[PDB]
């Protein structure tokens, strides 16, 4: 479970990535971690 504002997307790339676009976050690390 993430904090609010994080879009957890699963791309055909085969990788999970966390999208918080205020600033435009695309990160490998769970922001809850």
């Amino acid at each position: 479970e993430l904090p609010e504002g994080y879009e957890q997307r699963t791309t055909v790339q085969g990788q999970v990535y966390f999208l918080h676009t205020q600033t435009g976050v695309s990160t490998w690390h769970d922001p809850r971690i």
Binding site: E7, R9, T11, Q13, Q15, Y17, L19, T21, G24, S26, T27, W28
Partner: peptide, 8 residues
């Protein structure tokens, strides 16, 4: 309409 992917 398009988000960016992570570079690994």
């Amino acid at each position: 309409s398009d988000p960016g992917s992570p570079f690994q």
